[PDB]
Design an enzyme around this catalytic site. Structure first.
Site, PDB file in Angstrom:
ATOM      1  CG  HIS A   1      -0.399  -0.044   2.613  1.00 35.21           C
ATOM      2  ND1 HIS A   1       0.012  -1.248   3.047  1.00 35.21           N
ATOM      3  CD2 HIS A   1      -0.045   1.241   3.164  1.00 35.21           C
ATOM      4  CE1 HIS A   1       0.432  -0.990   4.297  1.00 35.21           C
ATOM      5  NE2 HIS A   1       0.521   0.635   4.393  1.00 35.21           N
TER       6      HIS A   1
ATOM      7  N   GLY B   1       1.626   5.317  10.406  1.00 31.79           N
ATOM      8  CA  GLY B   1       3.039   5.642  10.401  1.00 31.79           C
ATOM      9  C   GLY B   1       3.981   4.461  10.696  1.00 31.79           C
TER      10      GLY B   1
ATOM     11  CB  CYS C   1       2.599   0.725   7.205  1.00 29.08           C
ATOM     12  SG  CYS C   1       1.308   0.209   7.800  1.00 29.08           S
TER      13      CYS C   1
ATOM     14  CD  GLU D   1      -0.678  -4.494   1.775  1.00 34.99           C
ATOM     15  OE1 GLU D   1      -1.504  -4.975   1.007  1.00 34.99           O
ATOM     16  OE2 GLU D   1      -0.378  -3.067   1.647  1.00 34.99           O
TER      17      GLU D   1
HETATM   18  C1  AG7 Z   1       0.589   1.830   8.260  1.00 26.79           C
HETATM   19  C2  AG7 Z   1       0.128   2.567   6.993  1.00 26.79           C
HETATM   20  C3  AG7 Z   1      -0.415   4.047   7.272  1.00 26.79           C
HETATM   21  O1  AG7 Z   1       0.200   4.648   8.362  1.00 26.79           O
HETATM   22  O2  AG7 Z   1      -1.297   4.600   6.452  1.00 26.79           O
HETATM   23  C4  AG7 Z   1      -2.026   6.013   6.763  1.00 26.79           C
HETATM   24  C5  AG7 Z   1      -3.258   5.564   7.258  1.00 26.79           C
HETATM   25  C6  AG7 Z   1      -1.135   1.559   8.856  1.00 26.79           C
HETATM   26  C7  AG7 Z   1      -0.804   0.752  10.329  1.00 26.79           C
HETATM   27  C8  AG7 Z   1      -2.152   0.871  11.020  1.00 26.79           C
HETATM   28  C9  AG7 Z   1      -2.934   2.080  11.223  1.00 26.79           C
HETATM   29  C10 AG7 Z   1      -3.826   1.791  12.415  1.00 26.79           C
HETATM   30  N1  AG7 Z   1      -3.035   0.757  13.257  1.00 26.79           N
HETATM   31  C11 AG7 Z   1      -1.981   0.348  12.563  1.00 26.79           C
HETATM   32  O3  AG7 Z   1      -1.141  -0.276  12.852  1.00 26.79           O
HETATM   33  N2  AG7 Z   1      -1.637   0.518   7.900  1.00 26.79           N
HETATM   34  C12 AG7 Z   1      -2.892   0.994   7.655  1.00 26.79           C
HETATM   35  O4  AG7 Z   1      -3.598   2.155   7.741  1.00 26.79           O
HETATM   36  C13 AG7 Z   1      -3.340   0.226   6.520  1.00 26.79           C
HETATM   37  C14 AG7 Z   1      -4.983  -0.160   6.715  1.00 26.79           C
HETATM   38  C15 AG7 Z   1      -5.396  -0.660   8.344  1.00 26.79           C
HETATM   39  O5  AG7 Z   1      -4.210  -0.971   9.105  1.00 26.79           O
HETATM   40  C16 AG7 Z   1      -6.740  -0.675   8.476  1.00 26.79           C
HETATM   41  N3  AG7 Z   1      -6.840  -2.017   9.377  1.00 26.79           N
HETATM   42  C17 AG7 Z   1      -7.511  -3.036   9.013  1.00 26.79           C
HETATM   43  O6  AG7 Z   1      -8.311  -2.986   7.862  1.00 26.79           O
HETATM   44  C18 AG7 Z   1      -7.858  -4.043   9.875  1.00 26.79           C
HETATM   45  C19 AG7 Z   1      -8.525  -5.157   9.958  1.00 26.79           C
HETATM   46  C20 AG7 Z   1      -8.228  -5.850  11.058  1.00 26.79           C
HETATM   47  C21 AG7 Z   1      -8.967  -7.245  11.422  1.00 26.79           C
HETATM   48  O7  AG7 Z   1      -7.712  -5.244  12.045  1.00 26.79           O
HETATM   49  N4  AG7 Z   1      -7.352  -3.948  11.289  1.00 26.79           N
HETATM   50  C22 AG7 Z   1      -7.418   0.498   9.331  1.00 26.79           C
HETATM   51  C23 AG7 Z   1      -6.913   1.733   8.836  1.00 26.79           C
HETATM   52  C24 AG7 Z   1      -9.112   0.437   9.159  1.00 26.79           C
HETATM   53  C25 AG7 Z   1      -3.285   0.784   5.106  1.00 26.79           C
HETATM   54  C26 AG7 Z   1      -3.909  -0.099   4.210  1.00 26.79           C
HETATM   55  C27 AG7 Z   1      -3.288  -1.480   3.726  1.00 26.79           C
HETATM   56  C28 AG7 Z   1      -3.664  -2.241   2.451  1.00 26.79           C
HETATM   57  C29 AG7 Z   1      -4.702  -1.978   1.806  1.00 26.79           C
HETATM   58  F1  AG7 Z   1      -5.217  -2.422   0.585  1.00 26.79           F
HETATM   59  C30 AG7 Z   1      -5.198  -0.497   2.151  1.00 26.79           C
HETATM   60  C31 AG7 Z   1      -4.889   0.296   2.939  1.00 26.79           C
END
Ligand code: AG7
Length: 181
Positions: free
Chosen positions: A41, A146, A148, A72
């Protein structure tokens, strides 16, 4: 200084880099030669900002499994001067759990940051913001945006790349050595 701290700081010095794509800030893991890995992503383009300079990307591979399901992880070949210290020996041959793992993050916003995620367990399927994802693992730690790209490590083993969370739990894409052969 003990061995675990030494190992993580050595990763941070040699392999774990602060980067920026059009999607924002990420930790990048350089694995060997000019091959690095990022969360899919982050969507790296033709160039990526690495620490203090713009680096050209020569190839990007988005990993999927035999069923065509998102893993991913994107593998990037970089137009870098130097080879990364080869850390493929520290990546297990299959996706491996761990106890009392540490999440190591290195971003301009979160430089050299250590997160005590704890035990890392098998999880498998994960619907990541509507994208079906396989081969993930889980930690019961409230990871945040942040983080990731963060490198999941334990006892000299590099086992995951942080990819998401829901505010109570964090998930990584599992690493296995064959991804980098
Ligand atoms: C890292 C990337 C980032 O900072 O993007 C800005 C938003 C981030 C880490 C997580 C954010 C909150 N907690 C974290 O550790 N990753 C993301 O934002 C991805 C999406 C998510 O983490 C989503 N979580 C889920 O879908 C989920 C499902 C379950 C069972 O638990 N959590 C939330 C934001 C809803 C970014 C991403 C990855 C892949 C994609 F196709 C789209 C978006």
């Amino acid at each position: 200084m003990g061995p675990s701290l030494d190992f993580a700081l050595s990763l941070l010095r040699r392999n774990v880099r602060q980067v920026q794509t059009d999607q924002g800030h990420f930790t990048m893991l350089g694995v060997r030669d000019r091959l690095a890995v990022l969360p899919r992503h982050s969507q790296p383009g033709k160039t990526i900002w690495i620490e203090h300079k713009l680096v050209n990307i020569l190839d990007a591979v988005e990993l999927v499994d035999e069923q065509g399901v998102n893993l991913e992880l994107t593998l990037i070949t970089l137009d870098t001067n130097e080879k990364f210290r080869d850390i493929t020996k520290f990546i297990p041959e299959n996706i491996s759990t761990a106890s009392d793992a540490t999440l190591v993050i290195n971003t301009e916003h979160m430089p050299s940051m250590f997160v005590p995620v704890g035990d890392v367990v098998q999880y498998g399927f994960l619907n990541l913001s509507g994208k079906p994802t396989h081969r993930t693992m889980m930690y019961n730690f409230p990871t945040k945006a942040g983080q990731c790209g963060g490198v999941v490590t334990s006892v000299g083993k590099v086992i995951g790349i942080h990819i998401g969370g829901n505010g109570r739990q964090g998930f990584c894409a599992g690493l296995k050595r064959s991804y980098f052969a």
